């Protein structure tokens, strides 16, 4: 049972899930069966749904909130919700490498925007 | 009140043992939970030697409730050689509690039988 | 006055088990002093738990009292 | 032999304010942390705050009685 | 014999220091369970069985040193 | 000789109660600390409590030392 | 022997010091197992196993303590 | 005579078992005060009155405790 | 030989204090390791081996002490 | 003066049980400034003034009881 | 000198109330080793550098106190 | 010697109570340094720096106190 909308399309949208191992604010937590009531954000990271068996679909979540209800209801509202295939290897290293030499380098919110895109491109191309 | 109360909690600790036994005539499979090693036979603590360590807690609840209300005599001379206030309040705090002690004392021991049942029947 | 020289230190060694008898009824109460703030363990429910557990951590401090005034 | 062991016994027999002591800062712990939580004030926590310091405080009076009859009795 | 009734009232009174660790091993138990009660889910199961079968062998260390000190 | 010696071993062994009620002004004093940094209980409210329970707290520390030094 | 027989009562009561340990691991154990099954959902598995293979390791410091106390 | 002469060497050793409530103490209140300041705004006054004030109460079993061990040696 | 065999025993006994640290040192590794495990994923191997090594290395105090026990036995 | 010669070197040797609290005390208030200091940004003063000061006040428990056993030597 | 050999038996077992520090101190370094792990992702090195080598600077008490117990009844 | 020599032996005993504070203290420190680690990225310097100067003043109680021991006894 989980309700992983997002802000365009909905994935689990119906209640036919089991377990649920989504990065939220603190750890690489997993959502069993009735789980307790931690309504948490989510950071950027690997939110893959095992659906009963190894079916489990690696959908790379941007961040958002991982808000579980009482009634054994896990919605993970997330921002962006794209599969490990759909990142390609050749662009994402243009994209880390640019991010590194624009941090630190200018002033306002310059080097702190390229300083958390930086933490985010490094923890999705060792999962690949 | 004392020889009367360890007498009758000694009959009452020898028929959860009994009655265990009895039970498990019928169906028995052991008692205790499968793991990894084997070190759960060393650790008969419980069932039999649960029941004389179980019973004797109303006997030593007794005692510790009897020592209490029996310090009275000390703290008389004193009183009667601050002022004597402070004991009154101090008496009528050790007899409420003395008195709820055997609601807890009661439900205390009910529950420990309610286990013994429930584990001798599954 | 071998004894009569032991009997009085019997009961004062034997009183340092209060720490744990002491300390035990308010670990019980502090957690659910804590744990009745966040709706609704008020009537029954969590009553009927921490009544019960308090009875269970003071039959150390019971049980080691009667064998210290016993001398 | 009898008047040094009485002695003794009044100071070995403190041991045990250790329990006493924190017993008293533990609950008043959980019970400040909890009120400023919106809005455990008036009885509720303030009223088991009274009734579960004496089940804690009864640990040292207790013990403070076996050790006041040696030195006077 | 002096020195053997001096040992056996001495005797009692080292062993009772052992109440500490039994004392305190309920109320750690009833503290996490009364805690988990209130939230996820009920009390009459699941946290029921492991709080009586969790307070029966915390309990043991205290039986077998009361038994010691009143044979002593 | 044996009542002159045992009186100095009356207030040694009984100063051992100090770690309690040392140990709980700081623990007090944690717990309103770091409450009174949520927003707002900073007049009364909050200060009623720790005051009242620092002075309960100490009142262990000063009942041993009166049994210390009467016999000494 | 008169201090032959005062060392067996002292040798007893000073090693059921060792309870305060072997009490405690066993309630440390099910206070985390108890919180623990709360969060869903190892309940009969998984944590089952490790709460009674690891209430073994912490027992047996309460079992080899209690032999040689029996024996002196 | 000699018995009082020895007993007074082991009365400022025993009594000296206290200064662990009031060492612990002092990094007891240190470690709130350190760890709360940083989550916005406890710094200049309201906890800065509270930190300096409960860590002379704490420091109080300590001096307490010591000054029977000085008289006894 | 009335000295030796007196303080012989006492020795098997004053060593068997350390054993509260080995014993709830096993309890610690156990605590930990059993509210890691039901937060996901790491059960088989991964964080397996860090709590049968962890618990071998803390089991080493209470043997250790044990052996000077039985030695003066 | 045989009583009083021996009875100095086990002063100075049970009055070292303090240590416990003023070694633990440098550790409590060290936990608290390294995990703290990772929560943005106390970094420059701010926690660094109150650890420093902080850990001279728990250690002066470890200095005021060693000089009570080196005084008895 | 039976005043020599009654002490030296009893300062190897008095010395020995150092090992509750030194067991339980193994442990705690292994326990907030095995929480923080599950955490993501410090798994190879980083973390595990600082059990390691955090583990010989709690081990040097027992290994310390022992050599004083050791050296008495030698 | 008689009373002198049994008392020199008892001491340095006696005094290596304190490790329990000094053996702890290398954990504690070492502890909270390994799991605020995970946050990202405490690693050179920072939180390396506190850790090896807090290691420091947690040691100096059981190497103090340790010496006392050792001039009893030799």
Request: charged residues 10%; aromatic residues 8%.
């Amino acid at each position: 049972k989980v309700s992983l909308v997002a802000p365009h399309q909905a994935i689990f949208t119906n209640k036919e899930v089991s377990q649920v191992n989504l990065p939220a604010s603190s750890g690489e937590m997993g959502v069993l069966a009735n789980h307790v009531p931690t309504v948490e954000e989510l950071a950027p990271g690997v939110v893959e749904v095992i659906e009963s068996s190894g079916t489990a679909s690696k959908y790379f979540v941007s961040g958002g909130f991982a808000s579980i209800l009482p009634g054994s209801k896990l919605s993970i509202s997330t921002v962006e919700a794209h599969p490990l295939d759909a990142f390609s290897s050749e662009n994402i290293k243009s994209l880390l490498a640019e991010a590194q030499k624009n941090a630190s380098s200018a002033d306002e919110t310059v080097a702190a925007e390229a300083a958390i895109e930086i933490e985010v491109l490094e923890a999705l191309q060792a999962a690949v | 009140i004392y020889i009367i109360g360890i007498s009758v909690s000694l009959w009452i600790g020898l028929t959860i043992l009994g009655l265990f036994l009895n039970k498990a005539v019928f169906f028995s499979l052991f008692v205790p939970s499968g793991t990894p090693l084997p070190l759960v036979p060393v650790l008969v603590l419980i069932e039999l030697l649960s029941y004389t360590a179980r019973a004797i807690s109303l006997g030593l609840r007794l005692a510790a409730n009897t020592l209490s209300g029996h310090l009275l005599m000390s703290i008389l001379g004193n009183l009667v050689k601050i002022f004597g206030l402070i004991p009154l309040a101090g008496i009528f705090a050790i007899v409420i509690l003395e008195f709820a002690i055997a609601c807890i004392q009661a439900y205390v021991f009910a529950i420990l039988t309610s286990s013994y049942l429930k584990d001798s029947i599954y | 006055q071998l004894v009569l020289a032991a009997k009085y230190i019997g009961a004062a060694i034997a009183t340092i088990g209060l720490t744990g008898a002491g300390i035990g009824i308010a670990i019980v109460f502090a957690a659910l002093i804590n744990g009745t703030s966040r709706n609704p363990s008020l009537r029954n429910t969590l009553f009927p738990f921490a009544i019960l557990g308090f009875a269970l951590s003071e039959a150390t401090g019971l049980f080691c009292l009667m064998i210290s005034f016993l001398l």
